[PDB]
Structures are given as structure tokens and as C-alpha cells.
Ligand binder design. Structure first.
Ligand SMILES: Cc1cc2nc3c(=O)[nH]c(=O)nc-3n(C[C@H](O)[C@H](O)[C@H](O)COP(=O)(O)O)c2cc1C
Ligand SMILES: Cc1cc2nc3c(=O)[nH]c(=O)nc-3n(C[C@H](O)[C@H](O)[C@H](O)COP(=O)(O)O)c2cc1C
Ligand SMILES: C=C(C)c1ccc(C)c(O)c1
Ligand SMILES: C=C(C)c1ccc(C)c(O)c1
Ligand SMILES: [Cl-]
Ligand SMILES: [Cl-]
Ligand SMILES: [Cl-]
Ligand SMILES: [Cl-]
Ligand SMILES: [Mg+2]
Ligand SMILES: [Mg+2]
Ligand SMILES: [Mg+2]
Ligand SMILES: [Mg+2]
Ligand SMILES: [Mg+2]
Ligand SMILES: [Mg+2]
Ligand code: NA
Ligand code: NA
Ligand code: NA
Ligand code: NA
Ligand code: NA
Ligand code: NA
Ligand code: NA
Ligand code: NA
Ligand code: NA
Ligand code: NA
Lengths: 399, 399
């Protein structure tokens, strides 16, 4: 069915429908597919789904000139810990990714691989089964009691990374980025958001280190910036973006309760701008808005009203993608896209609307999403959401 | 004469005319007199002007419930270096300040002493004459070539403060604050803006130190925060405010060209909010806007459009005074005061309009200021600017 109480607005008369260049890619509109984990990859080997993933991405690439950021992809076995999320370290994985990228490109759209390291969000028992550590910034603060207990039960207590192990992750980011580009991707996004490993280093709650990787703003940002620099060197700044969620609380990050949080993220933005002014400007910065501090809460819940991401625009002067509860709020989008370097990521409603871009242009009703199939091993709730035309044929205008 | 091309707007229907409590003081409106050095103090001894200062402040206190921040006042001889700016270290000074404070209070208005240490902005030859150092954060970067040369010619080269000398300034801030309160002031403002000593520590251009007072965001903020903490302890948080100018370039500060500048100031704001949440909230934060990066340039010049002070509001949750080119822009004030904890400082047009508050309420023409008498040893351009009534009697409506 369509979302019942929603009053759509046509956004075709706004900058959402003006072309913009992101990295090497000439986008034809500014509605971006943010990274969306869907848990259809198959075990063993974290293989992108051989039956359905091509169709899923093909459907969502249908509007020419769309920027798609993939579901998060693990850079190595040690970076993972969810059996049904994909990786980008192995030949078999890349066989499937190549098909996905080719399909997106045949639709005249673009694809950026999000590179993920889970840290304390991983399942410690999966990691123990596979002979892998359970990693984070620190060893004395935990995501939650259940994770701590699971790690102990698995004889795999949370481990604070050594400098050597940080370097090994950096090597894996580099190789994952190379693999992604060689397989045909347009670029990569470094996931430094939503409470995963890099965010665990950024945040003073999760990072109690006293070496060069913690204990100050510069130190907490060090790992993120080393990854940025390593990827810029390996594949070029025009092929690299960075995702941040300053106000996020998902995965036990601090959000606005931490009075130093804006400074921490302002420092990162400033360091990116310094690199840009020195000739190496990242393709984009992607921000999760305080509109959505936890993306598993229904739209309108978990909204933080005590902060804005606007500060980033005073500092970073390149493209900015903003995501969080924008599908149901075209009136907010209309205002934000008056800024000529702002793009809008639409997550949950791109899950349910393969033709979302047309719907945004034309002010059409939106398909309701089914949260129960966000993570499910099924084509249902993955590739069977209808286009607007298909929904009319199903009678959804009368449901 | 009145400003010729100005189209006034009555602001009586805005929050500019709603009462607000700042520290211990119940303000009746939100038009603040920011600190304005006028150079009428007499030498020797940096004595507030015995003939005219009471009248100057009495005139500008005329609207009941006005918050006045004094001209900058030196905390000690070593903190000074301009012969005609006042101090707050000596009995003779305080005799004159007591008369000023009493006069302001008789008009049912309030007075906060701005506490100043000049650093590299001081005149090194005046300091040498008096047996005093020429101080800054560093010894290898200078305000400008003329200052560097004057210091060398005076056998008083710029000196990088020792930790002991920083502590001595802190002792002087404490005693100056005590003196101010004992003489009847309502509070003090710590000047950490406009390129004076504390700002010289905040800014990475002027602060090349490698000890605990430089080399990182936390370290550059250390001296400012030590002064805050010392004054809060001495006289109470309700009697202390802090002035900052994130985007200022006056006195050779970096402004927005420094990509880390927002982070530096976000850190300070965050540390103030942390103290507030722990029970010691400063009375206010006073910000100079990027509207005026140098207050000796005509309104509209030196405007930085690449940044906003709005970030501070995501971090610090108390009152905020904003200053910079607001008198000529009631349309901007009307928007900013929609925020219910925002006050507006009016500098140059309070020099020329003793009854500015009435003029703002009622949308009256403004007296043009005379920059040539901003710093002059004269009653002219100090105490002889007319009220609106007086200006009408002079025929200024027909000039
Ligand atoms: C099912 C689901 C999976 C997600 N997976 C990822 C991910 O792999 N990487 C990521 O950075 N964010 C991920 N997110 C967060 C989204 O990219 C997005 O920031 C969030 O859903 C807010 O946007 P929305 O309100 O448009 O959905 C996910 C969100 C959902 C609901
Ligand atoms: C003559 C003059 C003297 C000033 N003296 C001081 C001072 O003692 N302390 C201070 O913090 N700012 C001082 N300022 C800066 C003002 O407080 C204010 O921030 C600036 O003039 C911008 O506001 P305006 O456009 O309303 O004048 C001075 C400015 C002027 C023009
Ligand atoms: C890579 C995965 C599993 C993922 C899931 C959800 C979110 C919000 C995310 O950032 C990442
Ligand atoms: C204390 C003095 C001399 C002063 C003068 C001008 C400005 C802008 C300031 O901040 C301070
Ligand atoms: Cl619904
Ligand atoms: Cl799993
Ligand atoms: Cl004029
Ligand atoms: Cl002088
Ligand atoms: Mg251990
Ligand atoms: Mg906005
Ligand atoms: Mg169902
Ligand atoms: Mg020397
Ligand atoms: Mg504003
Ligand atoms: Mg003259
Ligand atoms: Na419409
Ligand atoms: Na099938
Ligand atoms: Na802005
Ligand atoms: Na789950
Ligand atoms: Na269905
Ligand atoms: Na009017
Ligand atoms: Na006289
Ligand atoms: Na705000
Ligand atoms: Na002068
Ligand atoms: Na005159």
C-alpha cells in the first residue's frame, strides 16, 4: 500500500532536479541512494546474493544518472561478523559485484561501494567461530551488556586494537578500495558513521585510549583520517567520500549529550578542507542528520532537536549529502536544496520505492515500507516492491 | 546629521524588547552596549576620565534595564600598553569606576567590566618606557612588521610567556574581577576576542607553542579556560561572561582561512557547556559576527560570507550576545532575535546615539558616527552626540 497520511509535493522545480558532478560522475539529479544493509548475502564467504542482488540494484538504478551507494561491504573477514552482509575482499565476492556494477552502469547510473569495519557492533560468536578477534578502540567500555557477555561466553573478549592492527585494517581498506574500482565501481565511501569501528575511535565514550589514537580530538580523528589519506593515495580523491553521523546514538555513540561532539566533527571537516585546499578534495562528505539518531526507530522518533549539521558547511566547501527522514518531508528538502552543493539521501523509502526519483519529481504517493523484510533472506520485501505504475495496476490507489 | 540612506524599522514588536535575565540582572530589553574603547583615560596611571566618563556612561544607561559592557579595562600594568585606556588594578582607578557604576545603576541599568590583556597588540615602546615586557603566546610570529620593529628598537623583543607568567596574569584577572565587583560592577566579561592575548593563544597562527598551552585545540584553549575557571571560582559563574570572535582577522588572527577555526571555537563552547551542565553556567557568551571581521572597516566591508556563528547554538545552551553591523540591518536583527536567548550588541551606533534603544524600539533615524573622534582626548564625539529630541531641535531632520 501507499503511505496513508502522506501529502506529496512535486520537487521537480527545485535543485533536487538539477545535475551535479560528484567525483567522476555527472549525476542528473540529487536524490542519492544511501548505503542500506539488506542481509541477502550468502554464507559461507559473505557473497553478494547470486539470485537477487543484480535485480535489486537494477531496479533502483532505473532513473538515469542516479548515484547509488551500496550496502555496507566488509573489507576483510576480521572487519565483518554478520554472515549475511557482503564483503569486497575475495574473487568470488567480486564476481558478483562486477555483475551489479555493470547492471547499474547499463541503466546510466553510478555506484559507490561503502567500505565497512564493524568493531564492537560485530557478533563476537561469529567471529570466534571463524578464529577472529572482537575489536574496538578500547577494552573497558562495551556497546551493551549483551555484546560484552556474548564475547566473554565465546572466549573472545573485546580487544583494544594495537597500532599494528590499525595499520592492518588500513591495508585492508586500501585493498578493498582497489578491488572495488577494478571491478568497475565509480568510487568508495568510507563508513565513519553509525557507531561502527571508525566512529568508535571518533567518539570519546567508546575511545578511552591513551596512545596517539585517543585522548584528544586530533587523536580520536587519527584513524579516520589515515584511512582517508590511504584511499586518496591509492585510488584518488575523486573516487573517495566519507560518511559521518555527528549526532548519532545508534551503536552506543554519544550524540549531542557529549558537549565536545560538534568540535570533534568540526575538526574532521576542517582537516578534509585543508586537504582540499592542498589539491586533494574528497568527492563528498555524507552526513546523517540529527533528524534520525537511530535508523531503526520509526520516522519522527529519536529526533535530536538540540543540534544541526549546518556547521559542516562553514568548514567543508565541497558537496554534502544529507540523509534522514527526508522522504516524508519534501517541505524540508525544498529548503535544504536551495544550497547548491546539497544532495539528499533517501534510505528507507528507496527500499520500498524502486522508482523513488520519479515519485519525488512528480509528487506521487510513496509505497509504505515493510520493516520486517529489511533484513530477511528473501526476494520478498527486496525486489517485489512495485513501481508507481505497477502499484496502480495492483489497485493501491484504492487501498 | 542622521545617516542618510538608512530606512529604519521599529523593532518594538520583536524579542529585542522582551525582558531577559543575564547573570544577576533583569534586563528590560536585549540591546546591549558591547565594549567600546574610547581612549579618554588619562596618563599617568590609566585613570578613567575624571571629567567626562560618568556623563558618557550615564547618557548610554538612559534606557532603564540596559546591559552595558565597559570599554576594555587592563587588569595590570603588564596587561596594558595604551596610555589612554583605563585599568582596574589601582585605588585611584577604582575611585573613578565606582562613580561610573553608581551612575549607571541610578539609571536602573547594569554594568559589566571587560577585562583585557593586550599581548602583541600593545605598544612595545610604552611598555619598555615602563619597564614592562612585550608579551604574546610565541616569540617567532608577530602581529605585523611595524610592531616587531618597534619592539626591537625599544630593546623589548616579543616574549613568549612562561607558565609562571601565565599564572601571574591569571592572578591579575582574579584580582581585577574582585576589584570590579567590590566597586559595584554587576559582572565581568573576559576578553578572548579581537586578537588580544587570549585570542593569540587560541589561534594557531599566533600560537606556535609546543608546551601544554599550544599545539592542539585543547592546548590552545587552555589559558582562556583557566581564566574562566579562576574567575568563576573567585566571583561566581553568574558574574562572568566570555567574548569570542571566531571569524575575526583584526590583530592578525586567522579567521575562516584557518580550516580548523570552527573546531577551535566549538571546543571552547563545548567546555563551557560541560561546566554549565556541571552547575557553573556562565552568564553569557558574547560573539563577534563574521559580519565584522575588523571593526575599523566601514559597515559592509570585511564581511566574511564563508562562515556562520550558528554552530555555537548547537553546543552552548545559555544566552548569546551577537555583535557586528546590526544597527544598519534591523531586518537581520528581526530574524536573529526570533531565537529566545539571543541578545544584540550595538557598538559604533551606540557611540553616536545615546538613546539608541528608544530609536530601535520606535524605528527612528540614527545619528551618523564620527570615526575621527572614536579615539580622541575630547568631550567632542564622546558626550555631545544628541538624543533624537535634541537632534530634531538642531534641525537634523532637515540636513
Ligand atoms: C535497513 C537499513 C540498513 C542500513 N544500512 C546502512 C549501511 O549499510 N551503512 C550506513 O552507513 N547506513 C545504513 N543505514 C542508515 C541509512 O543509510 C540512513 O542514514 C538512515 O536510514 C536514515 O535515512 P532515511 O530516513 O532516509 O531512511 C541503514 C538504514 C536502514 C533502515
Ligand atoms: C572604537 C571601537 C572600540 C572598540 N573597543 C572594543 C573593546 O574595548 N573591546 C572589545 O571586545 N571590542 C571592542 N570593539 C569592537 C566592538 O565591541 C564591536 O564588536 C564592533 O564594533 C562590531 O559591532 P558594531 O558593528 O555594532 O560596531 C570596538 C570597536 C570600535 C569601533
Ligand atoms: C554494515 C551494516 C551491517 C550496517 C547496518 C546498519 C547501519 C545503520 C549501518 O551503518 C551499517
Ligand atoms: C581594549 C582595547 C584597546 C580594544 C580596542 C579595540 C578592540 C576591537 C578591542 O577588542 C579592544
Ligand atoms: Cl501508512
Ligand atoms: Cl549473523
Ligand atoms: Cl550618512
Ligand atoms: Cl598609547
Ligand atoms: Mg583484554
Ligand atoms: Mg537547513
Ligand atoms: Mg510480513
Ligand atoms: Mg627572545
Ligand atoms: Mg541567523
Ligand atoms: Mg571632525
Ligand atoms: Na506538488
Ligand atoms: Na528467485
Ligand atoms: Na551556512
Ligand atoms: Na538485526
Ligand atoms: Na505485499
Ligand atoms: Na517600522
Ligand atoms: Na569638560
Ligand atoms: Na541552530
Ligand atoms: Na589607533
Ligand atoms: Na558636530
Amino acid at each position: 500500500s501507499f503511505v496513508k497520511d502522506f501529502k506529496p509535493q512535486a520537487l521537480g522545480d527545485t535543485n533536487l532536479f538539477k545535475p551535479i558532478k560528484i567525483g567522476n560522475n555527472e549525476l542528473l539529479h540529487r536524490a542519492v541512494i544511501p548505503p542500506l544493509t539488506r542481509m541477502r548475502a550468502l554464507h559461507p564467504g559473505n557473497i553478494p546474493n547470486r539470485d537477487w542482488a543484480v535485480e535489486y540494484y537494477t531496479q533502483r538504478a532505473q532513473r538515469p544518472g542516479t548515484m547509488i551507494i551500496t550496502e555496507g561491504a566488509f573489507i576483510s573477514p576480521q572487519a565483518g561478523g554478520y554472515d549475511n552482509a557482503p564483503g569486497v575482499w575475495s574473487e568470488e565476492q567480486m564476481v558478483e559485484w562486477t555483475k551489479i556494477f555493470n547492471a547499474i552502469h547499463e541503466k546510466k547510473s553510478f555506484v559507490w561501494v561503502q567500505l565497512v569495519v564493524l568493531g564492537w557492533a560485530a557478533f563476537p560468536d561469529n567471529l570466534a567461530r571463524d578464529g577472529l578477534r572482537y575489536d574496538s578502540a578500547s577494552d573497558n567500555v562495551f556497546m551493551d551488556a549483551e555484546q560484552e557477555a556474548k564475547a566473554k561466553k565465546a572466549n573472545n573478549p573485546q580487544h583494544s586494537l594495537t597500532k599494528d592492527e590499525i595499520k592492518q585494517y588500513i591495508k585492508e581498506y586500501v585493498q578493498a578500495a582497489k578491488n572495488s574500482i577494478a571491478a568497475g565501481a565509480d568510487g568508495v565511501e568510507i563508513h565513519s558513521a553509525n557507531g561502527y569501528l571508525l566512529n568508535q575511535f571518533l567518539d570519546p565514550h567508546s575511545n578511552t585510549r591513551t596512545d596517539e589514537y585517543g585522548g584528544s580530538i586530533e587523536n580520536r580523528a587519527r584513524f579516520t583520517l589515515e584511512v582517508v589519506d590511504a584511499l586518496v593515495e591509492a585510488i584518488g580523491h575523486e573516487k573517495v567520500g566519507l560518511r559521518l553521523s555527528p549526532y548519532g546514538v545508534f551503536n552506543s555513540m554519544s550524540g549531542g549529550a557529549e558537549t565536545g561532539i560538534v568540535a570533534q566533527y568540526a575538526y574532521v571537516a576542517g582537516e578534509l578542507e585543508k586537504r582540499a585546499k592542498a589539491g586533494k578534495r574528497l568527492a563528498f562528505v555524507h552526513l546523517v542528520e540529527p533528524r534520525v539518531t537511530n535508523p531503526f526507530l520509526t520516522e519522527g522518533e529519536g529526533e535530536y532537536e538540540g543540534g544541526s549539521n549546518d556547521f559542516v558547511y562553514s568548514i567543508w566547501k565541497g558537496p554534502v549529502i544529507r540523509a534522514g527522514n527526508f522522504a516524508l518531508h519534501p517541505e524540508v528538502v525544498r529548503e535544504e536544496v536551495k544550497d547548491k552543493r546539497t544532495l539528499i539521501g533517501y534510505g528507507r523509502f528507496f527500499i520500498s520505492n524502486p522508482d523513488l526519483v520519479d515519485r519525488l519529481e512528480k509528487g506521487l504517493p510513496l509505497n509504505k515500507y515493510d520493516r520486517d523484510t529489511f533484513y530477511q533472506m528473501s526476494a520478498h520485501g527486496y525486489i517485489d516492491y512495485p513501481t508507481y505504475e505497477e502499484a496502480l495496476k495492483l489497485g493501491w490507489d484504492k487501498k
